[PDB]
Design a protein around this nucleic acid. Structure first.
Ligand SMILES: [Ca+2]
Ligand SMILES: [Ca+2]
Ligand SMILES: [Ca+2]
Ligand SMILES: [Ca+2]
Ligand SMILES: [Ca+2]
Ligand SMILES: [Ca+2]
Ligand SMILES: [Ca+2]
Ligand SMILES: [Ca+2]
Ligand SMILES: [Ca+2]
Ligand SMILES: [Ca+2]
Ligand SMILES: [Ca+2]
Ligand SMILES: [Ca+2]
Ligand SMILES: [Ca+2]
Ligand SMILES: [Ca+2]
Ligand SMILES: [Ca+2]
Ligand SMILES: [Ca+2]
Ligand SMILES: [Ca+2]
Ligand SMILES: [Ca+2]
Ligand SMILES: [Cl-]
Ligand SMILES: [Cl-]
Ligand SMILES: [K+]
Ligand SMILES: [K+]
Ligand SMILES: [K+]
Lengths: 63, 82, 55, 100, 54, 83, 103, 63
DNA sequence: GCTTTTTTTTTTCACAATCCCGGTGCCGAGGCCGCTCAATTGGTCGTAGACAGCTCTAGCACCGCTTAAACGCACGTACGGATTCCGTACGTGCGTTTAAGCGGTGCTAGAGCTGTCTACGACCAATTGAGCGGCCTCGGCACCGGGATTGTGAAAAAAAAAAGCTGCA
DNA sequence: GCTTTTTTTTTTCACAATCCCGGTGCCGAGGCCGCTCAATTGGTCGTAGACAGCTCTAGCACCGCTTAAACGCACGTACGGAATCCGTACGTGCGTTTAAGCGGTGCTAGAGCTGTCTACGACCAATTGAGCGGCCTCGGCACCGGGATTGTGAAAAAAAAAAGCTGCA
């Protein structure tokens, strides 16, 4: 439970900043994705990007 | 006896900790030095914990007060309601 | 503290060095900016005692 | 004439292996608890503590010291000793940015 | 990884140590949680070479 | 489009100068190559994050602020180039 | 020896002089162009045809030199801790390990 | 300018957390004050609290 | 070379730690059941930001000259590190002492939840002055050259602590 | 006490490096200007949270057994560290080579700003099912005893390198 909340806060925090730096009002799947590349080590980031991309695609096809 | 509960951090407890950190041989001067360090650690952590307590207007320090303190100190802790 | 560091170096205007000397010579400011780098600030004059000529 | 005696360092290693294998807290709970409450006094009087606040503090402290000992050890070995001394701890904390 | 560490200890249920063993023995998870303390996890068995008998 | 191992442009004297500022009086021959490796790793890590900020902003030009955001991330906050 | 007449300074004397010199000054100690080539070269490995603000290269150099000057301070302590006056790769490696930069 | 923006972000961010931890929608002078106590060292915090309290008091009376 | 000794070498024995059988009992993981809510659905409305289109900032490439810095070698000192050696700080193990841990009871501070009500902060439209960019100036400050001053290192000259010698109490 | 030596002084001279000044000239700190946009004013409207009032959680105090852990003491080994000693890695200084730095120009990718328009997310009310607390159960897992086995090291007994010694010639 700690772990999920920890990484939730990290990704959401970086995402928040990404958007802020680029004068955007909206956090999209693209801010989450960048946040992840920045925050996760090499292999973990690739798999995490892969799973996130797969989940969004599946969702948009099933809307 | 003991307005200094810091002495209740026994030489043995200090040896055990040092063992788990892979320390084999220990100078006599370590146990008092370790107590010196442990106090500064708890001072810094409890200070911030108690600030979180005062701010919430409570007279009871919570696990969350400590968790928030430890994170602020860059010593994030999992398993106490993170 | 920067103004004073400028005055010591017979300068009218504060530069990054004056800020660095100011911050790094003050116990408390040094702690507040312990993980901050001041561009063009340099470091405090410090030669470990062992390294100096013996006699 | 005398049955068995272990040479200095042998039981040490025996303890290292035992404690590296376990996860239980290595400070007695009540002494730790009094120290916490004693130190809290200096910041605000008549403070109560959830038991899980004291247990959180002990976990965090023990973890911090174990980790500091790992770094202290390396400093000792770096100076070609096997005995951790205060200056080992001091150097670790200096490089860790914990101490001036 | 934790469920694997649990089966290797002949245990049905994951406890904090299995989580600790999982994380510290994985170079990348260890990095991600390099500044995290896992309550009731202890440390990986590890003894400096110079300290060993030979 | 040149690469050509510019790491050698981080000269011995330049590394000696940095060690002097750091208070270092005597230097093993082995240091120079060991430093170049350390410097490279540092830059890879900072630049990888700067460029991530660049790509996210949809730009082809790395800005000071990309670096300043990169350094802040890597717990190496820098004053006097913005933010 | 004697009236060789260079007045050869003893080993470590000029070293000390250089220390006082460089601890006095704030000017960057790596040559700008070599460093700028190295930055571009490392950036190619991540993305191709990248441009850099001149302030972006200066911010990277300020960041680098501060990091190495600080690692040398910590390296020097590790050398002295082992009763040496000469820094060596194991000094840097111990500093970086204790700093948590390296496993 | 970097310094001011830095400590703005630190104080504000700590305050954001304090209000969040206590289920409060509003950052007040009390959140700023508690943030300052957590963030600034001993003597610096004392002055800072003093100058912050003065300025609110003098503001409220001046309307 | 001889005898004599310490140092390292192996061999042989003791002692935990683990693993495989046997078992028991406690308590919390797990799963089911009402049913609190927050997630979903379908709707409206407003604006964030995607995109195209234009401006013009500043990032890139190039050249050629001067000279500061880098390079590579000669030379030797002081440093690193190996070896030796001595004193005792630590580790081991034992018997004695202490208080932690446990499981229970008894009391109540104060955590934490609900319901009420209004002070306070969001939102808006109109007003306007603080702070913006742009621009010009003039005095600080960077750089230089010259001279004063400070510190280093080598040899020589004095001062001191040390070594082998030698008699009297 | 006496010479007779090494060791540590001190003194004296040459020389390089650094420091401190005024002179000079350039350019950016500093301040002024005019226009703009963000801060202020005065207005409404809604709800966050201050407060009172009540519940009952869990935090505190206390008590009395049973050890496991702490304590202190004796004893000696192996470690820390001082001292010695030797080879060369590194610092210094020199001559030779290199390319950074400089100031300038020429070309344009693309940073960043504007205007247009609509897809997407906030907001809302109605519906309802996921996930919450509470509750009961039953098997995992902590712990136990009895052996066999294999890690982990400690003697003990021999072998070897080292150190004494000595009488020879
Ligand atoms: Ca993995
Ligand atoms: Ca069984
Ligand atoms: Ca039980
Ligand atoms: Ca079950
Ligand atoms: Ca029902
Ligand atoms: Ca209901
Ligand atoms: Ca919809
Ligand atoms: Ca020039
Ligand atoms: Ca109350
Ligand atoms: Ca309410
Ligand atoms: Ca004006
Ligand atoms: Ca202006
Ligand atoms: Ca002026
Ligand atoms: Ca108003
Ligand atoms: Ca475009
Ligand atoms: Ca259900
Ligand atoms: Ca449940
Ligand atoms: Ca057993
Ligand atoms: Cl010490
Ligand atoms: Cl090395
Ligand atoms: K541009
Ligand atoms: K309570
Ligand atoms: K759109």
């Amino acid at each position: 439970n700690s772990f999920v909340n920890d990484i939730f806060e990290r990704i959401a925090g970086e995402a928040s900043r990404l958007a802020h730096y680029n004068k955007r009002s909206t956090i999209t799947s693209r801010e989450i994705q960048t946040a992840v590349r920045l925050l996760l080590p090499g292999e973990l980031a690739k798999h995490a990007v892969s799973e996130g991309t797969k989940a969004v695609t599946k969702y948009t096809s099933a809307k | 006896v003991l307005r200094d509960n810091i002495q209740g951090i026994t030489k043995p407890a200090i040896r055990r900790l040092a063992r788990r950190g892979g320390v084999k041989r220990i100078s006599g001067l370590i146990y008092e030095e370790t107590r010196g360090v442990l106090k500064v650690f708890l001072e810094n952590v409890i200070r911030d914990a108690v600030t979180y307590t005062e701010h919430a207007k409570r007279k009871t320090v919570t696990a969350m007060d400590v968790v928030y303190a430890l994170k602020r100190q860059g010593r994030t802790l999992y398993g106490f309601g993170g | 503290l920067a103004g004073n560091a400028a005055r010591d170096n017979k300068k009218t205007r504060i530069i990054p060095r004056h800020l660095q000397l100011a911050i790094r010579n003050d116990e408390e400011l040094n702690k507040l900016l312990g993980r901050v780098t001041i561009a063009q600030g340099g470091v405090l004059p410090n030669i470990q005692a062992v390294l100096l000529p013996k006699k | 004439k005398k049955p068995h005696r272990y040479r200095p360092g042998t039981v040490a290693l025996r303890e290292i292996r035992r404690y590296q294998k376990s996860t239980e807290l290595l400070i007695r709970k009540l002494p730790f608890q009094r120290l916490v409450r004693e130190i809290a006094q200096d910041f605000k009087t008549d403070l109560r503590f959830q038991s899980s606040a004291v247990m959180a503090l002990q976990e965090a402290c023990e973890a911090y010291l174990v980790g500091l000992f790992e770094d202290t050890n390396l400093c000792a070995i770096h100076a070609k000793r096997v005995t951790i001394m205060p200056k080992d701890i001091q150097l670790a904390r200096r490089i860790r940015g914990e101490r001036a």
